[PDB]
Amino acid sequence: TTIVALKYPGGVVMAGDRRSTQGNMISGRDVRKVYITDDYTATGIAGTAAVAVEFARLYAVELEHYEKLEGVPLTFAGKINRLAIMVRGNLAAAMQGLLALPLLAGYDIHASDPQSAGRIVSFDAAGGWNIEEEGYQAVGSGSLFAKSSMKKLYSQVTDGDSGLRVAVEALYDAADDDSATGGPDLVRGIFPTAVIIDADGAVDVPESRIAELARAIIESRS
Amino acid sequence: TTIVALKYPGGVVMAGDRRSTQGNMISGRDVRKVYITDDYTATGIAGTAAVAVEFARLYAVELEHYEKLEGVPLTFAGKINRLAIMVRGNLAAAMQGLLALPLLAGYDIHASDPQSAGRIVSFDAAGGWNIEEEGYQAVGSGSLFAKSSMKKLYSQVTDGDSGLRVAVEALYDAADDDSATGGPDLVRGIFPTAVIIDADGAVDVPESRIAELARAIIESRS
Amino acid sequence: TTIVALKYPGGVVMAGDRRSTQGNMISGRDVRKVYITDDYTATGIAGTAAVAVEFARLYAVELEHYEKLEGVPLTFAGKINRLAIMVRGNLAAAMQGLLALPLLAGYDIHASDPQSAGRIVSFDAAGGWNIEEEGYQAVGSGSLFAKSSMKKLYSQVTDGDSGLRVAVEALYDAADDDSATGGPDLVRGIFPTAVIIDADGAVDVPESRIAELARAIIESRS
Amino acid sequence: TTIVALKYPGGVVMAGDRRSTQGNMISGRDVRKVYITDDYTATGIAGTAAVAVEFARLYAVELEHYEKLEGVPLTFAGKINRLAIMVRGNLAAAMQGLLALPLLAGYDIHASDPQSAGRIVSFDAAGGWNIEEEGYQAVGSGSLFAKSSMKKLYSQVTDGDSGLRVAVEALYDAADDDSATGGPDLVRGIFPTAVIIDADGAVDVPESRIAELARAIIESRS
Amino acid sequence: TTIVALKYPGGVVMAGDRRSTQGNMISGRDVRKVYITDDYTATGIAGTAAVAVEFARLYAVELEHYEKLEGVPLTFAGKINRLAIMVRGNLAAAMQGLLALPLLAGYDIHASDPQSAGRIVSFDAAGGWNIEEEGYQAVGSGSLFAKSSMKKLYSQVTDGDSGLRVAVEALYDAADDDSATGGPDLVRGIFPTAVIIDADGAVDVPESRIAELARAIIESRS
Amino acid sequence: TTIVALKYPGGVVMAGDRRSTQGNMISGRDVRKVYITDDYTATGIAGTAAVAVEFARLYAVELEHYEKLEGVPLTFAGKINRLAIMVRGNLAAAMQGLLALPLLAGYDIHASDPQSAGRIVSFDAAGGWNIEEEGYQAVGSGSLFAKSSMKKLYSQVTDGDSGLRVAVEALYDAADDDSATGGPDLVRGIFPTAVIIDADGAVDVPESRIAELARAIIESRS
Amino acid sequence: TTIVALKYPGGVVMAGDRRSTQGNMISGRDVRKVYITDDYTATGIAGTAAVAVEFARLYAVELEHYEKLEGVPLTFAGKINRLAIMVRGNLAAAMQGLLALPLLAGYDIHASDPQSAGRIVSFDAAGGWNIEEEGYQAVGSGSLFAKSSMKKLYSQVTDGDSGLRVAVEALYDAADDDSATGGPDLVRGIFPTAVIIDADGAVDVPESRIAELARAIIESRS
Amino acid sequence: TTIVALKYPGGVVMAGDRRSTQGNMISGRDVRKVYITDDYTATGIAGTAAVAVEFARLYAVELEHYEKLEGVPLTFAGKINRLAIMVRGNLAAAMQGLLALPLLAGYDIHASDPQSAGRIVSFDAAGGWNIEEEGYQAVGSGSLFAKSSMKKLYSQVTDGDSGLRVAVEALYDAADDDSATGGPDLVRGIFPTAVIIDADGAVDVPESRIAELARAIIESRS
Amino acid sequence: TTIVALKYPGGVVMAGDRRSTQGNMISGRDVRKVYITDDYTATGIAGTAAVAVEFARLYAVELEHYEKLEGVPLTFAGKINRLAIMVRGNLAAAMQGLLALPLLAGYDIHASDPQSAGRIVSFDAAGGWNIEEEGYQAVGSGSLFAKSSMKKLYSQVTDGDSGLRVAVEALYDAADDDSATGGPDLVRGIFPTAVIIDADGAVDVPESRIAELARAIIESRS
């Protein structure tokens, strides 16, 4: 599994692959690992697929619950803190095996600068969180290959479209070097999922744009 | 990894994938796992790549050594016995993780019937060997998927070409269900290696024919 | 044990073998593993027979209790969630050897199109659930062989009869390749149990039709 | 695996199943576990298949080696002693999982009464041996079922044909209660192997006779 | 220990041996293992004697307590469920050596056909229960020998007396092949205990009839 | 990680590096390890980054909570005792790897002599504290190198500027001999973070001054 | 440690870093890890520094010993085999912490096409070897980052100087992501060592040229 | 650490060294290990410094708490009992490493004879205590050497000054033979701390007196 | 224990402390750890005292043995290699507990520049060696403090006198921060042992000069 997130001028984008394995045997081919937690934040969890789905559901429920109760959404720092609390509370079971590494992408409406309101927060297993300043991050088994690909490709990111292309290319490299990450499947037409968050909210990227980006990348590599 | 072998009327065919992993990280993309041990026998060893190559080299050296010393090549049962002795003598080292499981394909030149001279020999962990009468066999991590694919496809095998197509399709199925087996990689043009043994001897299949078959299979499943 | 489920145009079919063993010794020859949980959903649990029976009973009581209390049945997502909760609760005992793996087949009456209202859900050991998109799934010790048989036979599934025949054939292949799975008992007249769910509900397939299909398959492979 | 041996007036018969398994997975269907060691001695070794084959080969070589060197065959007690020496020497390997349980059927030509010259010798793990006076013996995973059915059917044994039928029925009962023993496979036409030893020597029973007896037994059970 | 049960036209019969051992030492010669739990059901518990007596005591008390509270006896499925829960609640104590395996014979008065109203229920270690359909069952250390004897003798079971004879003979075979099972003690005049359940109720068999049956069996085998 | 603290005439200065590693892999480059706990005390925690952030946050919350509840800030000894209690209460979690060792620098506003009111408190693993009398202290992996550098450089400390320069040079030496401590980053423009406490309170040192000092040190070392 | 090797039109280049750490402490700042083994081969060992040095010495002595004894140098395959045998022999001590991971760069003077005569050989822990066709390879703790950097910069490689620049940039990225690999020390004037092999042989690259390349890279990334 | 305590006619004196170590590394140079628990009682705790400080604080708080609640101080036997209870309540921590061995010096005001009112109480790990009648006692790493020094020097103890001199000389011997005990530091001017308890209460000894005593001892030993 | 070595223009100087401890107990106060191995090399071994003395004696014997046999002394590289072979051979004992880490100082009479002929060779635990280019190196338990003292004091080294003073001060700092290192004993008159090597050879530094230097350092730090 690999999830990548990167900031572009005016927003953030998070993309993830679709493969689920049980050891070496491929058990899932259309898994979705990027969830729109709320109108301005998307979360993507690597590790055990079961724990990933549970954490996404429970974190979204917590954010919605607070917003409904108090009539105002949490600040981005509050969302970060609640996610870190979930990660810390998962520590014993993570040592036991049920492990989850989240990655959070968000848009800060309360930020003074709309252009630089995109935020990427990474979490370590102990519950600590770090707000990325380099403009990109990855989690999962193929995270190092994806990060080293984005390091070289990040100078091309100038809008949402180029950012999405770079994210898809990072996932492609991660799958090219790591067998637990699924590449773009042209036989089945299964492609990485992506979420773009800007000042207008968090919207799922339709499969058509991702499909044509992946096809262009595969043609370039050939 | 996966190596398949199957008998067709008039000979035997043996195909192998190209991927080698270290964990879930892909480390080799064009590993050759099928070796022409002698003019009428090919061997294919699954497991640790180092031990696989070492075993193939030692086995070929031993067979050629006997042929030079005694002036007559070993009978097929003699070759099977030598390979089984190697596998039995590697048991202790395989208990530490340097495991190797061979699969032997041959053309018995002393068999009365030329049309049923193909032989497939499978070796289990402890050094036992069985001459397969069902006509197909597979070794490796994707061996079960390849075997179950060949079980359904074996009624289409009538000559060398259809046998090769079925072997390539079995490798495709093994790669489809198992991440440690490499599928037909159209981006780099790396395709499974194959060897066909008939009355004329054992000859490597040119990469163009296997590429054509793999492309036809991919198109059919698209 | 092996339990297969597959979608056909207009519904779903779930079939299961009849053998239960204590190690290598056959201890039961007419075990029923496929339960009709409610009028539109059936479940099949592999693993320890005690835990399978207990889980089926508890799950059916849970669904019935909700339907009576609220006057309206649970949505398919609610049923999936309750089953996943049960599996996750079992995990602690499953590590001890009371492992139960369910497979859920259902007919979603709230779907837009009744021609594709069949649903198949697989569960992992940790509790994660996956709604199958390939149209077939299997659990049990012979699940790999059954799935590799259905992969090749699924192009023939057109109606309930085709789906039932393909399911019985997949169970036959699973029993043929796995000793813990029992094939059709021609001397005793014991055959796999199947359930067909369509718009009119979930109905047990009479043993006469399954006997006819099993005899046809055996005569085909002789 | 099950091998049975029983005495009839004027000789002995030894029969064996054909299945070999890898845990729960059926890996061999036409294995031969009964060997004609020499002109008046058959041996059948249960346990690990590789070790069984190696032990049969070694024992036959040792007997023929003594016969050629000393110009006279070993006495029956000498043969029993050599087999017991092999079993006692295999003790460490059996502790390492390379276990072998032999069963020896012979015809003592030097014995006084030619109508009671048959001899069945069972070997325990430690290398002890016992000449069976009950007139029947079994080794293997299903040996208890075979012995308990032979106890009830041994009153029907009067000649070679009745003895062969009783041996095949005992193997059938072993396969009925034990999943690691293969029953008569009427689909593939694979039947238990048998060797009949009498005053004229040891001959393999042709497959047609065993097929007829197996079909009769199956129809009687239906 | 060995306890057998078998259905006959119009009821069920359940017999048990009398020997209790602490290791290889015979400590009890007249232990009673078959209990009349209520007027239409008997239970026989193998394993440790202390836990067996406690289990029978508790089960009888529980059934009687329900009958007195509610004014109607439990249905047969209810009795099976209570016994199964009693078995399942003993997993922790049985892992320390306090294993108790029950076998339940009963007469379903609420069944449609009174001739096929007998029920034999066998429980496995984890608490699973199976209603035997073959007509006989056994528990204990000699259970396999008794079952294999009953498989051959069950065609002679035509009424209550022949069923009782077949049960006693199965016990004799189990005692013959297993040293933990006690045979008929002609010196001390101790014989297996038996209970017959039919439409009129459950009655202990008098010791004289069992004595004469055992004497007939012994004089047959002499 | 490495945090240094040192007194100068009329105050105290505390500096920390910015690198966070996971093993030998650099994961963070702008970590801030020095926190202004309250108007006159700063704290800096070495060890695990998650625990460091959580400890600093909780300690600041505790000090503020007491100040608001009682209307008066804690005495310096009270703050030391609270931090020591918080360190002692983490002894269980520190053994399993969530270690956090703090260093507390403060300006004792109740001290009689303004020019000697800077206080440095070091803590040990068991929660014991020591008010440093040598005038400097360090915590973290490079603490030994930092202390042995401050030993030689402390004669040059005379005011805030010289104290800040000596702290930065000590951090430079720690990074020069330790790879878990990050030195000045003249490519990314990341420099150690410092806090200066004196009679007017605790203020973060602007990055420009630290950049000037680090460049001067680097040019002196070339 | 990180050693990179890459092929360029007309030869091969091999660069390595200079840092040596024991745990986290930097114990060496000018280590040399690329050795000119012979006139057309450079070797570079990652892992334990002592084992690396002694392996380089043993390999050079072995190659020169063969050349002196037999009057002709070893073929490239022979050199690969000797290195692989050395690694396999070390395997046992490598489990004890004395690991050595070699990387071999050579110019095949007997190759048909001298423009493609450069060879890169990688070795796994088990002693197997692979000739890299991707044109680059890396060993050491930072080998993943170096490889993922070269994957994106290999297009630039057109001559010896372009290849050398990419090699230094790959080492820079490895040191940027990994704390066990040393970046270019502009303060001490310590830079990665490099060896260039072409038709004229293997020559050490002068330190000044690598200094210029490293300074250009640092300016580029500032 | 080493703490000595000796009686002289008319009172008691207790002295302690100043070194605190972390293994072989000196972590503290002016630790105060002798505390005035109350007006006529001093205590010195050896072992872990954190536990020593916590124990002294708790013990003093408890004594003052009782004196305030009751208006009368505890008797000496009561104080001994409270200290022994505190020791015995720390056995679990002592077994994991938080050892704390106290040494009590007191002036029994309720004693009959004013000259012999000094009391020295030694405690063991289990909580047992002894009122020492030899007139001196020591705890800590250098306790044995200090004991053996006081054994020879106690004949010179006649008044308070001679007792102080003997205590300082015993500490000097303990530091001379034990490297974890800190001797008089003439360079930093740090000397052992001492408390003299007499009929006028417990008084901290001025550092100047101990400095001149230590200098005289050093001169006499030169 | 601490042995320092440093280069000055025209030679090298190696000094060592005198303390030997058995745990916390000081056993020896006048141990000599610097040995004139031969007229131009001195060696100092830290760790177990027995192993240090044995290594020094054995190494000197080896060097003189070679010189007597071949009529010419070993080159400096040969001496380094012999010492490294001894260190590597001592690895089993070092794991057992007989650790010996050597430090070698020498004068290379064959050097191009007599002023740069001073050589310092540090050996790691695995036997690998490194010629220090820093100009200073320390071995032992206080080696880090000594090295970080010389890092600051090395600019003052301009001749033999300044180098000897810096070595003595580094030993003083190591003893100041480490309790296993013996500082200057002004009472017993025991001072570190130093050896100075220049073109005329290696000569022990007289005790009086080292005493004067130590007294000056102590008075400066007072």
Topology:
The structure is cut from a larger assembly and holds 9 copies of chain A (222 residues).
Chain A: E1 2-8, E2 11-16, E3 20-22, E4 25-28, E5 34-38, E6 41-47, H1 49-70, H2 76-89, H3 91-96, E7 100-107, E8 118-123, E9 129-131, E10 136-140, H4 143-153, H5 160-177, E11 193-198, E12 201-204, H6 207-221
Antiparallel strand pairs in A: 1-2, 1-10, 2-11, 3-4, 5-6, 6-7, 7-8, 8-9, 11-12
Helix pairs in contact in A: 1-2, 4-5, 5-6
Describe this structure in words.
The structure is cut from a larger assembly and holds nine copies of chain A (222 residues). Chain A is an alpha+beta fold and 222 residues long. Chain A has one domain (1-222). Chain A is 39% helix and 29% strand. Chain A contains six helices and twelve strands. Chain A has helices spanning 49-70, 76-89, 91-96, 143-153, 160-177, 207-221, and strands at 2-8, 11-16, 20-22, 25-28, 34-38, 41-47, 100-107, 118-123, 129-131, 136-140, 193-198, 201-204. In chain A, strands 10-1-2-11-12 form a five-stranded antiparallel sheet, with helices on one face. In chain A, helix 1 packs across helix 2, helix 4 (143-153) packs across helix 5 (160-177) and helix 5 (160-177) packs across helix 6. The longest helix of chain A has 22 residues, at 49-70. The two termini of chain A are 24 Å apart.
